[PDB]
From a paper:
Trimer III forms a hexamer with the use of trimer III in the neighboring asymmetric unit in the crystal lattice. The overall structure of the AmnE protomer shows an α + β fold with a β-sheet (β1 - β6), two α-helices (α1, α4), and two 310-helices (α2, α3), in an arrangement of β1 (residues 9 –10), β2 (residues 25–28), β3 (residues 31–37), α1 (residues 61 –78), α2 (residues 83–85), β4 (residues 86–93), β3 (residues 96–98), α4 (residues 99–106), β5 (residues 116–121), and β6 (residues 132–139). Lp2 (residues 38–60) is the longest loop and connects β3 and α1. In the AmnE hexameric structure, two trimers (trimer I, timer II) interact in a back-to-back manner through the hydrophobic region composed of six Lp3 loops (Lp3A, Lp3B, and Lp3C, from trimer I, and Lp3D, Lp3E, Lp3F, from trimer II). Six residues His123 (His123A–F), located on the loops Lp3, form a hydrophobic base with residues Val122A–F, Leu125A–F, and Leu130A–F present in the AmnE hexamer. Outside of the hexamer, six loops (Lp2A, Lp2B, and Lp2C, from trimer I, and Lp2D, Lp2E, and Lp2F, from trimer II) surround the hexamer and extend into the cleft area of the opposite trimer to form a solid football-like shape.
The amnE gene product AmnE is a deaminase, and hydrolyzes 2-aminomuconate to 4-oxalocrotonate and releases ammonia in the modified meta-cleavage pathway. AP–3 is referred to as the modified meta-cleavage pathway, in which 2-aminomuconate is transformed into 4-oxalocrotonate by the deaminase AmnE.
Residue numbers in the entry:
A (entry chain A), C (entry chain C): 5 to 142
B (entry chain B): 8 to 142
D (entry chain E): 22 to 142
E (entry chain F), F (entry chain D): 6 to 142
The structure:
């Protein structure tokens, strides 16, 4: 519909020609979200002295879910409206720490979840990207 | 709207097996893992080394998905999207054979990929589904 | 219901016992789609001089989206009804060319998008498969 | 066939697969759908047999092998590969290292092995 | 002959092969992990839920220590190593692995090649190292 | 004593190791990439968006030229190479890599093994090669 898609001010510009979130009837589809900042630096991938990124799954996961919360808030929803989470790791050795952060945000009572490790995410510094579906009738 | 199914394996994290949203049901990625955290279809050999069996795991995964749906008054006939995550495409033909025991071309859309890893090294398949069932 | 699933005439036969597209209320779920033709050859994987397939992400991505359009058209919908795109690459070095083709078809007023590289797709010649969700009330 | 190169007392054998000179594969029989069914047991046995043939071409044999590097694609294939390996070598034989790689050069392959052998002239 | 050696007090090899094989003046050491004799793993202690928590620093240190023990059992030492091949599973582990490597070797020591493979033979491993050493009898 | 060499003017090794190590009559050359001395990369020019675009042909040619330089610094040349181990990251790069390889080497020259690994030590890389050469003093 006319204003179904939203680019959210203050968030990182999407990697391609697509919005952060798309409404469809009562549903909201949130594009895969990373810890990347608007200046194209990465939360939780601070380079060390040699310039080598040191990815931190705890820091990136917390920032990804925080970013998703901001996106939902821009279209009148919040984390309590999320009904499906798809989480893409790059290494399952990051699972325990990612799971610990996930539990800071989602309770009983929360969305369905699926977690897999993919071969690569779109930037080599990423160790997590999450896409969600949310439900909130207008 | 959210459901923890009894006698199914306790979810890896703070999430239900299934979540209702309006007329829809979202089912979390499901494996052959039993409640006691052993796995159907990953029996250890004599050295203690698990031997994954894609046919056995796939059948148990879909059976488990059926059970989850049934706990909220739905069934496999209500499934509309299947996403399947293998770890090696050489397991495709067996997975494909078991899939056909449960679904046909009047059933759900299906997407199948091999991922780098599933959450337990014994696993060779996990499936998540979307189902449609107005109250 | 009885006519909710559709096998589309003129499209490649699905790899398993499933339809090209499935309606659920106002939504349409489109099965993961490749550049495979109805005759089981592939667009964008021409053999080189030794017979070794040479995958071409530009050509495959264009064919995949063209095919998704065909499937949607067969049930009275179109790319403008798409609301979520999930793209599966095998090599992130293919991302830039994939991204360029995606922009030929969709823009920021269109669907949410998620892109990851998987370990393997169902045929070794493939470098992209895409599944979509569309929204089109009857 | 994969090539062997002598260097002093040593023989370096190119990574060897179950592929034939005519580009067909031992141990990846296609189903009626045309999709290959890679078999680690058949491929491993053929690879080690192929390495034996290459070594015999230059006067050596598997008893002269001193290092084995094995490349799988799927560690779920390990147990069966391991059993075939034991048909040809034992603990008095070569050092061995086994990993799974992201890809081998052909999608039908589930094993490739490179070896170093020692056979002074 | 005496060319192949099974080193006492080390983890039993997972196939029918020795820890180290001599060939003329050379020693080939089989790929070595942090796995202990009792088949537990240094640097992959299970957490609260029983899930292994791999630690590249701890595993890398134990790997090179095991290789040192193996060489010392045949009268060689790390000063004799001439080629190191390191197999990670995740390049995000590189920096910590690299720092541990420097505890044992320097630029007067062996050539080194480091890659991340798809899988090692046990899922808890984040490093395995194969070496070639040179030690004339 | 003089068996290890850090080759002047080449990209600095990523860790505490030399470019090449002698062992008796053999030379072991560390895995080599297209990385320049200033730690930029040949064959991975960024596109408009600043995203690197790896080029297997350009990287492979630079890798072999670098290996030639390293061998020449210790008095050897490509003719002395007896084993080649090549690490790709995607087999769709294989044909082009092989074409460049054949510009330098006879196919019945050195023994060769080519696999695709999960990752190389820098994400811009699509090829790294390690060699063993034979050159008695
Ligand atoms: Mg058309
Ligand atoms: Mg024969």
């Amino acid at each position: 519909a006319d204003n179904s898609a939203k680019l959210v001010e203050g968030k990182a510009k999407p990697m391609g020609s697509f919005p952060h979130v798309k409404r469809a009837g009562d549903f909201l589809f949130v594009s895969g979200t990373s810890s990347r900042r608007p200046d194209n630096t990465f939360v939780g991938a601070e380079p060390d002295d040699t310039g080598r990124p040191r990815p931190n799954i705890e820091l990136q996961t917390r920032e990804v879910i925080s970013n998703i919360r901001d996106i939902l808030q821009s279209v009148g929803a919040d984390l309590g409206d999320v009904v499906e989470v798809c989480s893409y790791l790059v290494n399952m050795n990051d699972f325990a720490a990612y799971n610990k952060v996930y539990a800071e945000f989602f309770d009983a009572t929360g969305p369905a979840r699926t977690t897999v490790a993919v071969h690569q995410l779109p930037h080599p510094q990423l160790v997590i990207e999450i896409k969600v579906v949310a439900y909130k009738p207008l």
